[model samples]
Target: CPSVCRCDRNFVYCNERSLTSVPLGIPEGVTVLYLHNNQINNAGFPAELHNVQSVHTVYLYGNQLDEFPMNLPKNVRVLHLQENNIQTISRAALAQLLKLEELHLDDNSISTVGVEDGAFREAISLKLLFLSKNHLSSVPVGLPVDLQELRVDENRIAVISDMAFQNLTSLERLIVDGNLLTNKGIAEGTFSHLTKLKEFSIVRNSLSHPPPDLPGTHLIRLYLQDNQINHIPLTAFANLRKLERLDISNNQLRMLTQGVFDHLSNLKQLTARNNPWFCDCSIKWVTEWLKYIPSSLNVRGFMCQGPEQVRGMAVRALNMSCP
Candidate 1:
């Protein structure tokens, strides 16, 4: 009965209105429900929708919820509750919802998120989860198996255990930028078995050591810009086979020895711009590789920061041409 009203069998979308509560009189076979951008609170839930036993998708974002609504339908596939006042998520609260596919809790006051007694073990079908814009200081571990995308950016996370993401083998995209993960936080064997990782963004992490080794070679794009890296190990990119794009710009790189990019022969695009790259005989190997590779593979905005006189020279041509 609203501008955004769609209720047919198991779908309901009554969004963008001044309604303070969920509308009643929905069929039991309804599975999808959308009541976002409203003034609903915790009291509005676990009440009007409790009768809809077959509801699956619940979109109650942009509301004034302080705590999680209890007695949620177990058949829920997607739960979008962004822009709420939820502070803490207890393990007992999310024990149900075995078929949850996506859980969106961004822009909330959640400080801690975890499952103490394997609460999420039943929700193996969960795929996309958004936990950004929270007060989380650490990464949450023991996620579901079918998780594909995880957005943990814009948080206060300082320490990230490699085991935090060691289980999500089906993860395709992982966004951990805008946090405080340094080289010390990235432990070894963090991504050893993640064979399905395609896109990973670790930008804005003040890394002190070379990045950890990725397991599989299906990586299409990798972003590690805005860090404090200084050296790249010779075997850093050895395992990558299908790497297409790499962004390691805006860091404190000083050396890229010979055979640095040797193993990455399949690499099509690379971005080393805006970094303090030392151009010298140590960089001769990179110059030699550029000759064989296409020029378009290099991202623009590359410049040499050393040798004071040639401060504006393009990075791809650094030390290649004698001035």
Candidate 2:
């Protein structure tokens, strides 16, 4: 039992204190260590914890760490390093945690992360990764292939390479909102292999149109709100047959083609509010389809904003002649 820390069986709880260093003499049987909300600035685990093979979880978030803690137990599964000052993650920073599953480093100053080719090749057990609210201008390379969930929102990411998700065949949820992503920034076929993805969001970007090659047939929720999207191809959502919720609100859309939403047969909720919709013959089909899918339409503030004939009308009430 260390005098500076408290231990109970294999759980060590030492959080919220003003400790400036890793507590000394952690027991070998300890499995979970909670040392968050502290002022510790150390970049290495205490030497006394080197032999603690049973340690699996480590919470060092809300600290002043500028580097990844070294010499962590190989069996460590979850590591929380959020709200820190970490600026870079070297190639070897996480090389030892082969069994690491979740690594959360959100709300940091991470601008550059250096990983060797195939750095995560051996980290097949890694799953969830959070790098949100950082200074990253691009997606970090060398991610584990088995990762199922990833959050990199609120970064400066401007481009997504075609091979960005090349090996992430098992990924299911991907959140890249609040970035600088434009339609051209996303290469074609970037999401072609994400057939297993269920939830995908890219809200608050600069995209003028949907990704040309988004081929997720199993997606259940797709959010593309608050972008610059004006036009969607008739086959834009042809593969999203299983999509349950689709949000394309607050964009620059003036009119949607007749069959733009013909593929969303199973869509339960469709949010298309706040767009500059031009209610005319081109969009007459949407008004009729809204009746067909009344229960699925989420048009609380959705009003027609164009076409002199239907200037102040609601999209559902535009019963004018359609050619």
Candidate 3:
């Protein structure tokens, strides 16, 4: 072990040393290397780590890396490089990580043009990838087909082409929250390939209508919070028959269409708060549906902001038979 770093059997802890470079002479027997929260940058990172074959997990988050470091250990599977200054990634660099399963690059400066084409193709074993808080304008292309989780939240994405995720057949959870998405930006088949998708989020966007053609019956959770959605078309969530948890809070919804949730018999938790719900005959069906909702679901916050007689009252309390 280096004089400043501590070695405990197969694990090495050399983090928070405020060092400007990779610590020299790391023992080869180490399987886990924790060098996070340091000042090491691209100019100071050494290539000696390439020979540390036993190192499967490498933590270099909270560092000053301006680019993806190359020649990592051959067997490295989990690489944590979040909260760094990484601006670009190259295909050649990713081709070496054949065994990589998870790669964390969130909170970086990566943009649409920063990543080289086919950059992720060679990293075929990837299952989880985090690119949140980056500057991407669209989903990166050539992603590994076997990916199960992809997080690109809080980016600058405005349009999601139908092919954005068309090839990610194994995706289970996808989070695209806090971006610039709109109804028209999401094409018809954007989610068709994600049949296995269990959880999907598109919160904090500018969609006035819920994107149509959600994934099929396997979906369990869907989040559409904090958007401009005023109307959910009758077919918006028709495919999510198995959906269990849904959040449509803080939207522009007024009256939900009848039979919109008729097929969601598996729903367990729902949040429809902070909307201007109308207590009229047109909304009677939602009130009736609310009645059937199991008490265990904790359905919350449907106070009315509508018709004079029911204003400020819970929509469920007003008789929607109409005067």
Candidate 4:
């Protein structure tokens, strides 16, 4: 037993100990290691973690590592280094994780160029990657084909190449929430082959209009909240029959014309709050849809921003109809 660490059977807990380095003398047979919430700096990181052969899961989030921790245990399957100062991930650092399944580097300082091409060339088994809240400006290419969830939320990303994510055949959730994305920056065919995607998010963007060609069919949850979108076409949600939750709240939407939600038969939740919904014939369709939509569908309260008579009234409570 290390004098400073607590070894609990197969799991070693060395977190929040106010320590500044990777504690040595971790008892052998410890398969999971937790060293998070410490003030450890790069200079304090061990030169190599090769001595621990059986250790697989490692948590080093909330540290001060400026670069990828180059010499982690070779068989690591889950690694958490989120909320660090990591600026780069070189091939030499990723090639070692031959069995890595999940990698979390959220809230770091990684730039678009920080992650080199073919960075995951050897960590092919990776299925989950969290690079959210970083300094990225564009989606990276050469992601592992097996990756299922890639969260690049709150980045500076503004562009997507045509072939970006064309190889993510197994992707289920692709989140880019709170980025600098605009409809003009999305290249055609950017999400072309992502048929398996189920949950999608482009929330809090600069989109004045909803981008077309969003991944189709299997989409179960769609989040477009807090954007500048003012209108949506009939074909925008044409085949999203499987969609369950939709968030279009806090946008610039003034009207949802007739038949806009006709195709979404299985929708269970709808969010339409804080929009500038005017009381007029154009909005009669949305008000009618709210009446007929199944009670199981949870619709958020939306108020009228026009027609002084109905001002501050819930759109669902309006009594008048189109003449």
Candidate 5:
């Protein structure tokens, strides 16, 4: 190839080369650059790329970058910086990237993010953001309003304010699993503004109860597994008519009423396994509706643990007399 990096037409491969700094003599008009799996530390933008104006995509992952790279091309659309040592992302670090759409920064040591009040206001074209596996304790504010997908999983977040996502009306998928989220950590009507939300996941958290009322009617998949939930309100899923899949497995549920899922008419799959279900009149409503539920679902974990005679029996097969 090229003088400083391997070139294959418009794609440049500098990955896994153990480079300690930005390579020099990159070819002009390069569109995609891959610089992952290196030892690059304290590296700034390559001076050779200053006159080139066609760079669009950059991959700087798995490096020793302790801060966000500067002097990125303004035309860049996608930037992958995962698995690095970046700890802070101030407004000045991202000032010139106005056309960026996708940003991947997962698996870093970012404990502090954002500097100004509207740090990401200039990045209006941004749609997807990945900040997972960081040391953040709260959701970062001043995110772009047009963001559609946000993954902040495996953080130390314990509480979410009421309007944490107030202006992000276009958000569709939000994943915040494997954190310290509890029932009290969520404010009432916290997710009431996300009308376009579809999939929401909070698995492997410390929640002892279900989240507050979900406001999105177009939601399709909801994942709340590996929690401590023991009860769900009747009106919790009142307006969700388009819900398709729901997973609440491995919880502390012992009983459930039919009204809990009254609004989920389009539901096709359900995973309620590993729950300590009580097979009595209280759960009679669920047994009565088992015939309508698809057989493809795994109903094996709906075993009973009460009433001596019905102990160890599947709740779906119960035909007991109720008082």
Candidate 6:
């Protein structure tokens, strides 16, 4: 007989029993199942789950898995599958899950995830997806149509094709941090289609120049820190009308052209710290823009890195320090 399992109001908690695989008697009425901290090499739909169409969430983390499992219930909404040995996923396998909304596939050995053209094409209801800490080199294509939040940080992605995110016009927050990207990958109109994007991060890249065309009205917060940018086109960021916060710290910038940020009427906070800014006439425009910005947005760390003795001066007085 199945080891006298205990069930408490549609919740089953079992672990460390040397489960070689999922158990068979996990009452079909259980809604939330926690089978973590086990030695299961791989997992498939538990037969008991067939009758529990009410299973909304499953916690199968900390298992010895190598690939995503198929045959989940239609009512399941959340699947936590972290701390596994998974590498690649077939898009066709996930397309079978129609009601899956939130998926956590982090902390694994994933090198490539395939979302075959129209794989998730039918699961248009998916909202949040976490693919961080993987080995992805290129942005995967054929995402869900209604995908809103996608986190693909800490990967090997060097190039993010403009077509990679096609049809995801409803995306709101995107995090592509801790990657091997450069400015060259960001083409003009690269993010123009994301008219509804609010928070975007491209930190930790090897960029030298800002992309010419970025999101216009919907962008709220932007993080472009830790790059190699020395100069930016005066009109590069002019189109981000709704941009409120910008972090361009840790770059090789020596000067900023006049009116470089004149068009950002809604920009509230600007971080240009940890850079090699030279206190010269070319920086006078930065001082002008500083005066127009609210004091809260003017960071005290915006010190001058050149023209000795002016190293720690506030950006507000950069023009007066200039010859």
Best by TM-score: 3
Q: Against the true structure, whose lDDT is highest?
A: 3
Global Cα RMSD, each model: 3.3, 2.1, 1.9, 2.5, 2.3, 2.3
TM-score of each: 0.86, 0.93, 0.93, 0.89, 0.91, 0.91
Error of 1 at 223 (Å): 0.8
Q: What residue runs in model 1 are displaced by over 4 Å at the alpha carbon?
A: 1-24, 47-51, 113-119, 299-301, 318-323
Off by over 4 Å in 3: 292-297, 321-323
Off by over 4 Å in 4: 1-28, 38-48, 317-322
Write the residue-wise lDDT of candidate 6 on 1-323 in tens digits: 24744567778776656577776776656678777777666564564554557777888778888777666566778888888777767665576567889888888887644334555555656888898888877777667878989998888888777777788889999999888888777555667788789998878877887656777768899888888888889778888888888888888988877777778778778787788887767777677766777765645346787777677677687557445
Q: Rank candidates by TM-score, best first.
A: 3, 2, 5, 6, 4, 1
Name the lDDT value of residue 146 in candidate 5.
Answer: 90
The model with the greater TM-score, 2 or 3, is 3
- Deviation (Å) of 175 in candidate 1: 1.1
Across 235-320, the per-residue lDDT of candidate 1 in tens digits comes to: 77778878888888888887677776667666767777777776766667666666677765655545667888766676567655
Arrange candidates by lDDT, descending: 3, 4, 5, 2, 6, 1
TM-score of 1: 0.86
Using alpha carbons, what is the TM-score of model 3? Answer: 0.93
Per-residue lDDT of 218-240 in model 4, one digit per residue for the tens?
A: 88989989899998888888777
Instruction: State the displacement of the C-alpha of residue 207, model 5, in Å, after optimal TM-score superposition.
Output: 1.4
Q: What TM-score does model 2 achieve against the real structure?
A: 0.93
Candidate 5 TM-score, C-alpha based = 0.91
Task: Pick out the ten consecutive residues of candidate 4 with the lowest summed lDDT.
Answer: 43-52
lDDT of each: 0.73, 0.80, 0.85, 0.83, 0.81, 0.75
Candidate 1 lDDT at 285 equals 66
